[PDB]
Amino acid sequence: FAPTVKICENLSQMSFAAREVILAAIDARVDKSVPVVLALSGGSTPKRLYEELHEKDLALLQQHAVQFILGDERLLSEDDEQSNFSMATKALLRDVPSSDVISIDRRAALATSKDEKGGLDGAWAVAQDYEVKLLNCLPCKQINGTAKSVPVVDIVLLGFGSDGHTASIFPDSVAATDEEHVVSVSFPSPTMSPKVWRVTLSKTVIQYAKHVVVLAAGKDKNWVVRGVLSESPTDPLPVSRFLRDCRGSVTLLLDPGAGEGVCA
C-alpha cells in the first residue's frame, strides 16, 4: 500500500487537487467515446469541487465525458436538502445531461428510513434496485471465485467521518462487513448525522476502483488518517482501514489538522 498524501492549506487547494485527478483521467482515456465513471461523495466537503467542475469543465460533461453515480446516499427525497443528490445537483448536476447520471430510487425506503431499527428492509429494497441499475449501466467484470460481477469505477471520491467511516460504510453496520453485495446498507454511527438509513457502494466496489480520492479536513479526522496509514494495525482502528486493500491508486487530500504528523 502506497497512497499519495497531499496536505493542503485549505479547501480551495484540496478541491483544485481533486479536480486535477478527474481531468487527468478524462484526458488519459484511449477511447474518447466511453466515459470516465465517477462516484460522487456527499456531506459538505466535495461541494466546492462540484461547483468548480460546474464553472470550469461543464463543456466536457455536456459531451458525456463522465458517467456520474452516487457512492452513497441518505434515504431522503431527492429534493431534501440533506440528500447528496440535492447537494450534487445544486452544485453541478443541474447542468449535466440526465443520461450521464445514474439515479437512486428511494421511494421504497422513505416511509421507514428515519427508523433506526425498522428501516432495514426498505434500505435493502433501495440497495437492490440500485445494484441492478449499476450492473446494467456500468462497465463490469466478474468477481473471481463467484457467479457475480462488480462495476469498475474509474474514480471514487470519498470523505472521512470523525468516527472513521467513509462512504456510508459505518462502524458496526451491515456495510462494514458486507462482502457479498455491490450496494449495501447502514445506519449512521452515534456521532454521525443525518439520522437516516443509507445505501452505499460496498468495500468490494471501492477496492476494485481504478482510483480512489479521499478529501478530509479537521483535527477530528487525524486518528482516522493515522489509523489508515499505519503499516501495522493500530488502535483506535478506523473502519476505513479497508482502503489499504484497494487494488487501484489511493490519494488522501488532507488539511493540516487531518494530516498532522504524517508528512516529513
Domains and CATH numbers, the chain: 1-264 (3.40.50.1360)
Distance between CA 67 and CA 199 in Å, rounded? 19
Runs of H (alpha helix) within 44-119: 47-56, 58-62, 84-91, 107-110
Q: Which three cell numbers stand for residue 49?
A: 469541487
Q: Which three cell numbers stand for residue 30?
A: 484511449
Phi, psi angles (nearest 5°) of residue 98 = -60, -35
Of the candidates 88, 40, 85, which has an alpha carbon nearest to the alpha carbon of residue 67? 40
- Is the alpha carbon torsion for 168, 169, 171, 175 positive or negative? positive
Bridge-partner residues for 215, per DSSP? Answer: 159, 253
Contacts of 14 (CB under 8 A, 6+ apart): 8, 45, 49, 215, 217, 253, 254, 255
Count of Cβ atoms closer than 10 Å to residue 76 Cβ: 21
Contacts of 200 (CB under 8 A, 6+ apart): 71, 72, 73, 167, 168, 169, 175, 183, 184, 185, 186
Of the candidates 212, 216, 215, 204, which has an alpha carbon nearest to the alpha carbon of residue 249? 212
Q: Is the omega angle on the peptide bond into residue 139 within 30 degrees of 0, that is, cis?
A: no
Could you tell me the resolution of this structure in angstroms?
Answer: 1.7
What Rg, from alpha-carbon coordinates, does the chain have? 17
- Is the alpha carbon torsion for 40, 43, 49, 52 positive or negative? positive
Contacts of 218 (CB under 8 A, 6+ apart): 162, 255, 257, 258
- Is the alpha carbon torsion for 173, 174, 177, 182 positive or negative? negative
Query: How was it solved?
Result: X-ray
Of the candidates 192, 160, 197, which has an alpha carbon nearest to the alpha carbon of residue 175? 197
**Angular region, 110: left φ>0, alpha ψ -120 to 50, beta rest:** alpha
β-bridge pairing 140-142 and 149-151:
antiparallel
Q: Report how far apart, in Å, the C-alpha atoms of 127 and of each of 15, 154, 183, 200 are.
A: 29, 21, 5, 8
Bridge-partner residues for 249, per DSSP? Answer: 211
